[PDB]
C-alpha cells in the first residue's frame, strides 16, 4: 500500500493497494530488507520476495517446520533471523541464499530484534518469562538474560542508541532494561 | 527361484543371485533361509534420484526375514553400493494398514511418537519420531524413508529424531 | 593396480587422485553447505567487531 503524506510541500493521488503478492499457504511474519526491494515472509515456510516479481524468489526453510517470526538485520542488512514454533531460532544469510545456523531453546521465541549499533547481537523474547541477548558468532550462550517479567514475553525492541531494550509481555505490562544489567530498569 | 510365476525383472534376478550367494555362504546358518521368497522388487525414487529397493514379502515369513534383516541388508548393499535397501509386507482398516506399512517400512529402530501439528492456515504437519538406534545411520535415510512412505501411501509425513537434527 | 609402475615411459596423465565420491544425502549435503555458509557469514560480521 501507498499512503499520501503531508511532510514536504513540494508538489501540487491513488493511495491504496499498488500490488498483491500471493502465496498458497498462510503467512505469519514479514520484514523488509533495508535496501534492494526485498522482503521476507514467514508462515508455513519462509519465502524471500522482491517487489517486482509476483512470486517468491527463494524458499529458505531449514526443515518442514513452520516459522512464527522474522527480523532482518539493520546493518549487515543481508542477515535474517526467524523464530519457528519448534522452539527454534534460525539465522539465514542472503549471500549464500541459505540458512546459516539454528538453535533449539526450551520454550518458544516470540520475537527477535537486532542491535542497531552492534550488528551481530540480537535479543530474543520468549515464552519462559525472560529475554535473551545472543551473539550471532556464538549461539552456545546468551550474553545476557533479562529476567523481570512474570508471564510470556510477547515483543522486544532496541533503542536506536543500542543501549537499552523495551520488552512487553503477556502480563499486562511493559518493561525497559539497560542492556548491560539483566533486570528491569522500569515497568509501565 | 524367488519370483512368483510371472516374469522376474532384472532387479529380482540380481537380488535372487544375492540370495543364492548367501546360500553359497550357507553352513554358518542352518536352514533358516529356504522359504524366503519374494513378491516383487520395486524401486522408489527420492528427491535426489537415489532410488530405494523395496523388497516385498507376503508376510508369513517377514518375522524371520527381519530377524536376519541386518546382515543381508549389509550383504545386499555390498552387492549394490549406494542404494537404500528396505523391506516391506503387503496389505474396517487402512489406518492399521498404513500403520503397519510405516512400522515395517522403517527399520527395526522403533518409532517413539506420532505428532500432527495443525497450523493456523489450515495445514497439518504429520511427524514421526525415531529414537536412538544408530542415529548416524538413521539421519542419512530419514528423507528416503519419507519418500518411500509417500510413494506407498500418498501421505506426506516428516521423519525426525528427538536430537539436534 | 593402475599405478603398478611399469618400465620407464610416463608421458601420459593417467589415473591419480580427484575422483567423484559417492554423494551424501541431500539433508547432510545441505547441512554441510549451511555450515560453510555459517563460517563465511561469521567471518563477515567479525569486521564489525572492530
Amino acid at each position: 500500500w501507498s499512503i499520501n503524506v503531508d511532510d514536504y510541500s513540494n508538489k501540487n493521488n491513488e493511495e491504496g493497494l499498488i500490488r498483491t503478492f500471493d502465496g498458497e499457504s498462510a503467512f505469519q511474519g514479514i520484514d523488509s530488507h533495508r535496501e534492494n526491494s526485498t522482503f521476507a515472509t514467514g508462515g508455513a515456510k519462509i519465502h524471500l520476495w522482491d517487489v517486482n516479481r509476483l512470486k517468491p524468489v527463494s524458499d529458505l526453510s531449514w526443515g518442514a517446520d513452520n516459522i512464527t517470526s522474522l527480523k532482518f538485520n539493520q546493518n549487515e542488512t543481508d542477515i535474517l533471523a526467524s523464530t519457528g514454533s519448534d522452539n527454534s531460532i534460525v539465522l539465514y544469510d542472503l549471500r549464500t541464499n541459505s540458512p546459516t545456523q539454528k538453535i533449539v531453546q526450551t520454550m518458544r521465541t516470540n520475537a527477535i530484534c537486532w542491535n542497531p549499533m552492534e550488528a551481530f547481537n540480537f535479543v530474543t523474547a520468549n515464552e519462559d518469562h525472560n529475554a535473551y541477548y545472543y551473539d550471532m558468532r556464538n549461539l552456545s550462550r546468551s550474553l545476557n538474560v533479562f529476567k523481570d517479567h512474570v508471564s510470556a514475553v510477547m515483543d522486544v525492541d532496541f533503542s536506536p542508541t543500542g543501549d537499552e531494550i523495551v520488552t512487553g509481555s503477556y502480563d499486562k505490562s511493559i518493561r525497559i532494561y539497560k542492556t548491560n544489567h539483566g533486570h528491569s530498569r522500569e515497568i509501565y | 527361484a524367488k519370483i512368483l510365476s510371472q516374469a522376474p525383472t532384472e532387479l529380482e534376478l540380481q537380488v535372487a543371485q544375492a540370495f543364492v550367494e548367501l546360500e553359497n555362504s550357507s553352513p554358518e546358518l542352518k536352514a533358516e533361509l529356504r522359504p524366503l521368497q519374494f513378491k516383487s522388487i520395486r524401486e522408489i525414487d527420492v528427491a535426489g534420484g537415489k532410488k530405494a529397493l523395496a523388497i516385498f514379502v507376503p508376510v508369513p515369513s517377514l518375522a524371520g526375514f527381519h530377524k536376519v534383516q541386518t546382515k543381508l541388508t549389509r550383504e545386499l548393499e555390498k552387492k549394490f553400493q549406494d542404494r537404500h535397501v528396505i523391506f516391506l509386507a503387503e496389505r474396517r482398516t487402512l489406518t492399521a494398514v498404513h500403520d503397519k506399512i510405516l512400522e515395517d517400512l522403517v527399520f527395526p529402530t522403533e518409532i517413539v511418537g506420532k505428532r500432527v501439528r495443525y497450523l493456523v492456515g489450515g495445514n497439518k504437519i504429520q511427524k514421526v519420531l525415531l529414537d536412538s538406534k544408530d542415529v548416524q545411520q538413521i539421519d542419512y535415510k530419514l528423507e528416503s524413508f519419507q519418500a518411500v512412505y509417500n510413494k506407498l501411501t500418498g501421505k506426506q509425513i516428516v521423519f525426525e529424531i528427538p536430537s539436534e537434527t | 593396480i593402475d599405478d603398478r609402475q611399469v618400465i620407464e615411459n610416463a608421458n601420459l596423465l593417467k589415473g591419480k587422485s580427484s575422483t567423484y565420491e559417492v554423494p551424501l544425502p541431500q539433508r547432510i549435503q545441505q547441512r554441510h553447505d549451511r555450515k560453510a555458509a555459517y563460517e563465511i557469514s561469521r567471518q563477515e560480521v567479525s569486521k564489525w567487531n572492530d
Binding site: 545456523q101 533449539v104 531453546q105 526450551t106 552456545s140 538474560v145 | 539436534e164 | -
Partner: peptide, 28 residues
C-alpha cells in the same frame, strides 16, 4: 544446594546457558 551437598558430580551450569537445549554446527 542440598542435592549438591550430597551428590558427586553436579555441573555448575550457567544461567546464560540454562536455556539452550541444543545447537546445530557445534562450536570448538
Amino acid at each position: 544446594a542440598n542435592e549438591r551437598r550430597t551428590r558427586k558430580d553436579m555441573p555448575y551450569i550457567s544461567e546464560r546457558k540454562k536455556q539452550i537445549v541444543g545447537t546445530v554446527h557445534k562450536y570448538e
